Subunit: 219 residues, 6 copies
């Protein structure tokens, strides 16, 4: 069960220590890049990616919640991103072109669906993804209501992968915590994007927080 | 001669130490908040403001390079901003409304003009500003060509203040460094927004960097 | 067979009398709120809703043909709306958030599909709707050509409700008149939004108009 | 001193009586048409204009607070508008074209400036206007703070008219009431757009309301 | 096997001769009309259509890669277009209205899907199309990578036509050349839009070019 | 008196001959590149520039009537443009950046104002222009009403050049014909952009057309 900490939830006062801890414990760094337009909020950016790059060995995954993802691929590659997760709802008319550009920069391809987007949306290019993520909450902020209906999406995504003989990992984004770990794993999740409720909030010290989270995942 | 370090140019690995140093040496924290639309880039956000707030006593100045500044005033106030610098080119039809909202949150008012916007743009509300900033480079990125033509704008802004008996501070944003300190002061600048070329770049250690910059300002 | 008169088709000269008549004869007040952007036209608004509220006991249903439905929920609730009908094509990325906000204001949830949007568009939240409406004409104006192809959508919507054990009412919007009553009922319609051709136009006096309409529905 | 009642402030329950009263007492009908985009609100529309047309002899003045005024000229002419008031900030690149279209429909030309727009904005076509209006409040809603700074704009507009030998009427829009009548007349206003605070609010009965307003204008 | 030369790939120096040759050899003239917004590029326009009209008898097919197809139907009809090919992704909320407008102008209806749009997108109006085109490359430019995944779309489109008893022609747009002729025909293609790689590039002289292409189609 | 033929008005049937004639008789090729958004129309594009480049020695001047001029500079340079004429109303926040990019491509800088934009709009960078053009008609189409008011703009532009000791050429765009030649020269025009009414329309044969135009300019 892979872990991907949401950096928009970290403590910048302990930036260096938290990144180093995460780099030696987690599987991915989840970096949210918002537009203020595709979603009503602003969080991280290439600048943040560039800084995390200084002490990272694990892959930096940039979730592009922006209107024009085409504008950030080259810039994000230079900042040190390893994964570029695209929203199918922002790439109609350019999905293949962008996926090629992403790989031309030696980065991996991620696809992320918000609540109301069906998996078929990616049917013609789902086989080009290394990881597919399911928003279990409408995008934009931390601490929003979990959307149970998304469990079926996780399952459908798992069945699709098996039936088509694909190898993409299934990730979950949105209120991944003690109240949802079980259902999510049962549904088919391979990766957990953990934020404030699932990690950082358990202890002011990240070691203790991670230990607590790890213990809770046990069940 | 007041100083306002551009935080999008800081080193997050030494976040806590750099903020504390800046808080006891500078006059303002310059926090750039970009849209990806008003300017083609993404840098800081309310989240960032919130983190800097943890150890700040000096005022946090949020430069709103966004299409809809109305969407960030309440959120920025809650994150701990003290100054909200508005672009006149984004408030036609709502300048007075926003200025009132800014003060209802007990924050100071800043006005910032990019290169091609004349000072008259603010003629009907220039007297409500605590600080007026002049972009000496087209907004968006660090390390762009200085625009000499902007010197007249700084001067005009100083003459306007005197002639109208106003008290706003005149700030400069864009390539403030050894090559421009003199001309800028002569033109009428009161505050220097210092970034990579003017500060951070002089020494890996911020104390030493600040010493070098201060020395260069001497001339 | 429930009736919902389209108020953008009423006679303001007899505002008070028509609203009172409608309030004691119809099941819903259909209030169209257009953007000028989502659809190329402008009709009613919160102001209108507020006025109708003065003498209404039946529920006011606000059909949001706007780009940003999020901007009107609180304002419409305040004006007295009881139903907020959302276009699935304007809520991708915020359907669950908005549906929660609507209920937080004690209003009922409506979902409306224009001609080219399939029912699956609502598959993950169709069970949260009190009423689902089918546009039988491209949105925007009154008196446009009926779209027969929409009959299958009404049917599919009825089969879906039965198969999933749901209780939403099925509404029809667009050229509901003598020429379509039969087919619409046969297809599965529960509610008729009646405008100029189906109601108001039959007689300058609304009692007589309603009488004629009721008689025509008989067949 | 001409009067132009803001219809978005009227009582629809007494639609017919208020329009008839206004038609025989006022000089213009002020009809606000909003986009939800140019200004954050929705009020009246062509439908509304069409209804007022049924009993009007005085000119219907449609204030276009919309992003694309070009989309409403033919439709508004068709609904019965007599005046089309354009926002200079929405016609750059098409002012002359639109002014010609307005006159090709036999309608008069109005120009309206919001707070932060200087009179020079209209310098190349100011001589084509029958009436020029000054927003004394940021556009969008009723009951907002009066903007004293706008008095100079009214004056400048009067001086311009005299100096250039023009004949346009000067109108005021925004918090025209007892607290501002005097200053506005002194500044140069020819027409008062009266809303809730200046008219409708004085008495539930419009005759009495109008009587009180007229008396207050006396001073 | 019908041919439709992409005019954005022709040689304007030999305009008259190439159009005349094409008019007596091809089945359609493929005229690309781009927005700079729907796709990131600009190519042909009504002006171009008008010129080709001077010597054409074969139908001019205008592929509308624009944000607002509604703005070009009357103008294109006037310039002499015979076919208007619409993108389903630009007509939600107005497909039936536009299709009717196209036919009021006595023009034929075309529907074109870019890579990531499924055929169901047109399910409610697919029967109104004379020709349906499949983009085998993300729209915008010539010489992009062929998308094999689109072969299934061509097939599905053929099965749909048979199963529903429809008569639309199936067209292919994007890298139609020697490397793809076979697979495309096998998949179900009826018409080939030929550009630089498939036609013009084979010989500076268009007769010779057309010969080479025809020979390659043989296999 | 320099001449710049508007190619959107040429005859493509005689493409090669007209370009060659123009290349040996005119001073510039005026190539209009429209967005469909900045102005409501579509005309020429990089493709067109590329073709004219095949037989041109005189400079190709691309007038960018587009929302995002930044998207076309590299592409246009590649196609062979020599002049890039920018609209000040589309470069606020990037005028200096774009002007630098234009020169990095070894192209000359043009600035074009539509009717309602004052010359001051360019005050901070007017000295970087090789040619400044005045629209004497709202942009978008050929054959629109001449705007006399623009004569003052031409004059002001000439006075500005003299007073500031600049060397830019003054160009006129819009209904340059027999009815306006005199006034335009008197006002200060240095270059005439000639279209259908001023050139092409005088004779089906371009030699004769040019002959007639040249003679009319004599007066
Ligand atoms: Mg995320
Ligand atoms: Mg800044
Ligand atoms: Mg409706
Ligand atoms: Mg108004
Ligand atoms: Mg094409
Ligand atoms: Mg031009």
């Amino acid at each position: 069960m892979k872990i991907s900490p949401s950096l928009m939830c970290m403590d910048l006062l302990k930036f260096k220590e938290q990144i180093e801890f995460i780099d030696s414990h987690a599987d991915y760094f989840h970096i949210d890049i918002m537009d203020g337009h595709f979603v009503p909020n602003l969080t991280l950016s290439p600048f943040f990616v560039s800084q995390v790059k200084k002490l990272a060995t694990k892959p930096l995954d940039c979730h592009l919640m922006v209107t024009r993802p085409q504008d950030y691929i080259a810039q994000l590659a230079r900042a040190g991103a390893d994964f570029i997760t695209l929203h199918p709802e922002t790439i109609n008319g350019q999905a293949f072109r962008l996926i090629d550009e992403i790989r031309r920069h030696d980065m991996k391809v991620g696809l992320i669906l918000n609540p109301e987007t069906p998996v078929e949306a990616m049917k013609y290019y789902i086989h080009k993804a290394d990881k597919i993520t399911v928003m279990t909450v409408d995008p934009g902020f931390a601490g929003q209501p979990f959307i149970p209906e998304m469990l079926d999406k996780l399952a459908e995504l798992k069945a699709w992968r098996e039936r088509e003989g694909l190898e993409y990992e299934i990730e979950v984004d949105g209120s991944c915590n003690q109240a949802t770990y079980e259902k999510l794993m049962a549904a088919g999740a391979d990766v957990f994007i953990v934020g404030t409720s699932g990690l950082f909030n358990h202890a002011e010290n990240i070691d203790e927080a991670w230990r607590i989270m790890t213990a809770q995942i046990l069940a």
